[PDB]
Design a protein around this ligand. Structure first.
Ligand SMILES: *[C@@H]1O[C@H](CO)[C@@H](O[C@@H]2O[C@H](CO)[C@@H](O)[C@H](O)[C@H]2NC(C)=O)[C@H](O)[C@H]1NC(C)=O
Lengths: 50, 49
């Protein structure tokens, strides 16, 4: 920057700029069946899971 | 004495589910059921599907 005690710079023109800002609002909602994942629909399993 | 008496030993080595099996236990086969939820016993593999 050129700096002086008696010097200033003043804009004689302007520019209009449009910019995009992206913010995540939500994430996928998920539900898990505990017996289906661990027992895999086994009758013998889930007796232990009680 | 029994400790010194001769003993005949037979050792059986085998794999079960993996591979085609020409040796099977004495269970009668049943007609195949498809498109329904059923308990199945294919070559000693048991599952519900
Ligand atoms: C400020 O800037 C704008 C452009 O960014 C200037 O407008 C241009 O003027 C020239 C002629 O001098 C034209 O050929 C361009 O087509 C114009 N641009 C647009 C987008 O219209 C404007 O003249 C400048 N103002 C000053 C004070 O210099």
């Amino acid at each position: 920057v050129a700096y002086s005690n008696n010097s200033i710079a003043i804009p004689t023109n302007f520019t209009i700029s449009v910019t995009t800002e992206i913010l995540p609002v939500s994430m996928t909602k998920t539900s898990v069946d505990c017996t289906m994942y661990i027992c895999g629909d086994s009758i013998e399993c889930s007796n232990l899971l009680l | 004495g029994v400790n010194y008496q001769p003993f005949r030993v037979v050792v059986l080595s085998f794999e079960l589910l993996n591979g085609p099996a020409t040796v099977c236990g004495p269970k009668l086969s049943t007609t195949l059921v498809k498109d329904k939820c059923v308990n199945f016993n294919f070559n000693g593999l048991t599952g519900t599907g």
